[PDB]
Amino acid sequence: RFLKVKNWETDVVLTDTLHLKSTLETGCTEHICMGSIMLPVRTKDQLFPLAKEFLDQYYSSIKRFGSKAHMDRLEEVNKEIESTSTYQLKDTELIYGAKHAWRNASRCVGRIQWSKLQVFDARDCTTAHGMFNYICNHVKYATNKGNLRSAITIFPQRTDGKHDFRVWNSQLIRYAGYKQPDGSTLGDPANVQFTEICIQQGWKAPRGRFDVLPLLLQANGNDPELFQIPPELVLEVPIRHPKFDWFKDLGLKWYGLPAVSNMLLEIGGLEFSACPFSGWYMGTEIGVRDYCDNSRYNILEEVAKKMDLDMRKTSSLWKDQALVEINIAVLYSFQSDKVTIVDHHSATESFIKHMENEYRCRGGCPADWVWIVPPMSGSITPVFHQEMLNYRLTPSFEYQPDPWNTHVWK
Amino acid sequence: RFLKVKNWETDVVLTDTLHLKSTLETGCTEHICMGSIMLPTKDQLFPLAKEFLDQYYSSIKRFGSKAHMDRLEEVNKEIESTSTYQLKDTELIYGAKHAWRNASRCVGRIQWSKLQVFDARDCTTAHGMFNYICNHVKYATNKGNLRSAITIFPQRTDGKHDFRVWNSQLIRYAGYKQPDGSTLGDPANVQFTEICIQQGWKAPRGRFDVLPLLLQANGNDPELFQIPPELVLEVPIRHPKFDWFKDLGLKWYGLPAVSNMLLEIGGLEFSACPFSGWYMGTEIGVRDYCDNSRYNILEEVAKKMDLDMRKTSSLWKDQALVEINIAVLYSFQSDKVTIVDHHSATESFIKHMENEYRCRGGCPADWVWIVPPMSGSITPVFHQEMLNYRLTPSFEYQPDPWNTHVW
Numbered sequence A: 001r002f003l004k005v006k007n008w009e010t011d012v013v014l015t016d017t018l019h020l021k022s023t024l025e026t027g028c029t030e031h032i033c034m035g036s037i038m039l040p041v042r043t044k045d046q047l048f049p050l051a052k053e054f055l056d057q058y059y060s061s062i063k064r065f066g067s068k069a070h071m072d073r074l075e076e077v078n079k080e081i082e083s084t085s086t087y088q089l090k091d092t093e094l095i096y097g098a099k100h101a102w103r104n105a106s107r108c109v110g111r112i113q114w115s116k117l118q119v120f121d122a123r124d125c126t127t128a129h130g131m132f133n134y135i136c137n138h139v140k141y142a143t144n145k146g147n148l149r150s151a152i153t154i155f156p157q158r159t160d161g162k163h164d165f166r167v168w169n170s171q172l173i174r175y176a177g178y179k180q181p182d183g184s185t186l187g188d189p190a191n192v193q194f195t196e197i198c199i200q201q202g203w204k205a206p207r208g209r210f211d212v213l214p215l216l217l218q219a220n221g222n223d224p225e226l227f228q229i230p231p232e233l234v235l236e237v238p239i240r241h242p243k244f245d246w247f248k249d250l251g252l253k254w255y256g257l258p259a260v261s262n263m264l265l266e267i268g269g270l271e272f273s274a275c276p277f278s279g280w281y282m283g284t285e286i287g288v289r290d291y292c293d294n295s296r297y298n299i300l301e302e303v304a305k306k307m308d309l310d311m312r313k314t315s316s317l318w319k320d321q322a323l324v325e326i327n328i329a330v331l332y333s334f335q336s337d338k339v340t341i342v343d344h345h346s347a348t349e350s351f352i353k354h355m356e357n358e359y360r361c362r363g364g365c366p367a368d369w370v371w372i373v374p375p376m377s378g379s380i381t382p383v384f385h386q387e388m389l390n391y392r393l394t395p396s397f398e399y400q401p402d403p404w405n406t407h408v409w410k
Numbered sequence B: 001r002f003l004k005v006k007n008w009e010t011d012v013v014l015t016d017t018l019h020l021k022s023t024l025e026t027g028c029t030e031h032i033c034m035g036s037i038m039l040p041t042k043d044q045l046f047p048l049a050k051e052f053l054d055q056y057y058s059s060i061k062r063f064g065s066k067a068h069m070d071r072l073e074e075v076n077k078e079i080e081s082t083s084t085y086q087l088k089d090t091e092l093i094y095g096a097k098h099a100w101r102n103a104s105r106c107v108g109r110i111q112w113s114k115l116q117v118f119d120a121r122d123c124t125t126a127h128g129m130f131n132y133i134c135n136h137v138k139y140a141t142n143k144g145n146l147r148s149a150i151t152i153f154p155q156r157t158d159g160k161h162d163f164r165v166w167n168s169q170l171i172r173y174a175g176y177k178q179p180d181g182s183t184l185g186d187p188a189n190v191q192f193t194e195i196c197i198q199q200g201w202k203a204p205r206g207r208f209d210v211l212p213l214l215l216q217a218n219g220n221d222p223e224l225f226q227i228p229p230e231l232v233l234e235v236p237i238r239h240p241k242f243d244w245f246k247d248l249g250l251k252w253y254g255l256p257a258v259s260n261m262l263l264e265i266g267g268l269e270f271s272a273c274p275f276s277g278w279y280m281g282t283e284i285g286v287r288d289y290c291d292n293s294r295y296n297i298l299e300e301v302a303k304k305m306d307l308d309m310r311k312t313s314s315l316w317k318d319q320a321l322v323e324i325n326i327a328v329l330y331s332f333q334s335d336k337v338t339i340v341d342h343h344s345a346t347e348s349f350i351k352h353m354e355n356e357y358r359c360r361g362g363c364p365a366d367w368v369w370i371v372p373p374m375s376g377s378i379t380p381v382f383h384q385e386m387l388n389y390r391l392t393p394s395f396e397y398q399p400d401p402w403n404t405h406v407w
């Protein structure tokens, strides 16, 4: 069954056959759509078919499907599974898998860049200190003095579920948050709970508005351990406005490396619970969400005041006005400091070309509209007008529960 | 079975059970979400009639009463004999209100119970429809103090005697593709604007010409009618700061009135049921004015604001967008014409969702349509999880008549 997707701004119609290979569930049914819902140890029994599916995709991608190399590998893996209950991926398969989990990430608007991904094989790591070293090298390589390079570091896969490797931080770089006795919060409200764990674990918090949190690393299922990322390795950008000279006095800055560290990478049925990855920011992640979400730095008012906007009634659109300036500032500061960043128009225009390319050469591109459309100026970006089909393909990146809610402390 | 919905800005969680009464499909499957797709017999009839009457009586606290049972049998017998039936005025009103209540893509449903219903089921001709429509327009406009309303024409019979309002909305501007290759007026209406032209209309070939109604009664060919200008309230768009704004020569009509949908109540289909509420500012300022396929006025407005349109990263399109929308709301409020900004409207919707969850056990909502076209995450609906499902009575999409009509 072929599915048609239309762009109501250009009438370009596309056909999707790719979804026919989808296997996982979406959370929706023929009676209800869960499209805006944020979150809707394997057995030998279930593992081999997952491995086969993967190795077939892999061997077909290199044009060796049916080859002896392909057949042998299938027998090798199969034997290994029956022999050990699991199996190890060749380096080539790991790189391929990692790149494809990104290619399949329907919530990611930056996928045009999917084939350019530096993969760091950290499967030989055994300790938290070991993890710390691998992560510092990832941060340095990735930051590349402001000229960002996409990368991912992959730690040992899950075995019995009692020896998981995990990066407790949700992102490698984020600012601490502190709940004050008067109910106010200093720093980033999103990280208050994690910040409490770090402090409890021994972190000496400077209790400021932009303190970089310490890495909290768990190796082989052991209790996690704290590590400070060398400051010289954390690239930061002071935020200022090209016209509003008072903007800088707002005392704002943000880090340049966005590195998701709490997701699970699944390849051939194998689970990589610690797989920190990074690209570069789209301006609105910082300017719209991090700075203006009511539950984050919530800076709209203050910026609103300084601009002396009519804040008496919402219909003045004072919030919308301050929002644009804040985002103008973030983009301005990053470009001035020569730190890679992409605006929402560029990013979405690019995703549109990527998507079209993918329908033609791949037969589709799963995409989650709800996440793809930028948090500001939605309809003046091309993705707003683009019908998208969302389905799950593997390899893929999945959510997993927070470690503090599952870990058995030793 | 009991689904939960979370608001990520406020941590509030609501439990949904209303979906368990859903009956129609969504377009999605366990393997694919089509949440962003724009358009995903006597025996058939009685069951629909029963589901409806059941909920109607339940709403009036007379569920399983004799009246309930009596009516169920009357309609029952009526279908067996007439292959259809007629709703009691009370049922018609209840149904229309609930079709609105069930409109998952409508953000202004907090207003759902206040709906003026005009029963035009006795209409028989295009002139009759024109009279009913002018009356609707006038009543709803109320000199600027808009009142929500719907006018319901005769239900479908054998499909060869359907009533239809060929316009997509009661009041729209015409569009004509010029020699230049460009488009004059509303690009969206070029096809309709032509069907009028070709049907007989004499276009003033302007940029904001109110289109003529094209009514179809009982299946006959449609006829043209020009709405009395004094009945079409318009608003000249000026900025509360940019005196030059006015020179753009922009204006918009005050009455938003969808006329191409189908109202389904207890199995019956009303193919001509124009309805209207009042505008949320972004509909005009963001979509009508700034869509590249509409009046596409960003550049012009950006130029007059003297912004660097060299690089997209200066966010000139964004800046202008904000001014344009500040103007729209400004004017409307200046001319005392009802309008609502996306902040106020979305805030209302959240409040309505909370009422619906605690009083009805849920509220179907299509996030893709509920979140405003600009400033998405600064409105509360952006952070609100929404479950979408189809309940009846409802408003459904239907084929444009000119692709089904046999002249």
Ligand code: HEM
Pocket (backbone or CB within 6 Å): A102, A105, A107, A108, A109, A110, A111, A113, A117, A150, A151, A152, A260, A277, A278, A279, A280, A281, A282, A285, A342, A347, A397
């Ligand atoms: C090259 C630069 C890239 C850009 C500009 C880009 C941009 C984005 C943005 C704007 C989001 C939404 C983030 C949010 O709202 O929290 C996103 C999500 C995502 N990206 Fe990308 N991305 C890039 C690279 C990457 C890389 C390298 C990977 C994978 C190897 C990746 C995988 C994902 C995933 C899995 C999500 C959704 C995360 C979640 O569910 O929380 N992205 N991306």
Ligand code: HEM
Pocket (backbone or CB within 6 Å): B096, B099, B100, B103, B105, B106, B107, B108, B109, B111, B115, B148, B149, B150, B258, B275, B276, B277, B278, B279, B280, B283, B340, B345, B369, B395
């Ligand atoms: C009184 C204030 C009301 C407000 C502010 C409001 C606002 C909205 C908005 C912003 C949309 C999206 C329109 C678009 O983007 O095309 C919408 C759609 C819709 N509304 Fe409401 N509405 C109101 C009244 C009504 C009434 C009276 C009805 C019907 C009884 C209604 C039924 C619907 C339906 C079915 C849709 C979706 C139409 C489509 O799919 O094209 N609305 N409304």
Ligand SMILES: C[C@H](O)[C@H](O)[C@H]1CNc2nc(N)[nH]c(=O)c2N1
Pocket (backbone or CB within 6 Å): A008, A384, A385, A386, A387, A388, B036, B037, B038, B368, B369, B370
């Ligand atoms: C493709 C996508 O479904 C389409 O652009 C939708 C998105 N959300 C919308 N939301 C509203 N209110 N109105 C629309 O016309 C749309 N268009």
Ligand SMILES: C[C@H](O)[C@H](O)[C@H]1CNc2nc(N)[nH]c(=O)c2N1
Pocket (backbone or CB within 6 Å): A036, A037, A038, A370, A371, A372, B008, B382, B383, B384, B385, B386
């Ligand atoms: C409830 C709703 O799904 C939620 O607020 C989503 C919407 N779209 C999003 N899109 C992106 N890119 N990031 C987010 O965190 C969200 N949050």
Ligand SMILES: CCCCNC(=N)NO
Pocket (backbone or CB within 6 Å): A171, A258, A259, A260, A277, A278, A279, A280, A281, A282, A285
């Ligand atoms: C770190 C924020 C979420 C993912 N965003 C991103 N731009 N990845 O590279």
Ligand SMILES: CCCCNC(=N)NO
Pocket (backbone or CB within 6 Å): B169, B256, B257, B258, B276, B277, B278, B279, B280, B283
């Ligand atoms: C007629 C435009 C779409 C519906 N909008 C509206 N505000 N209804 O009342």
Ligand SMILES: [Zn+2]
Pocket (backbone or CB within 6 Å): A028, A032, A033, A034, A035, B028, B029, B032, B033, B034, B035
């Ligand atoms: Zn869905």
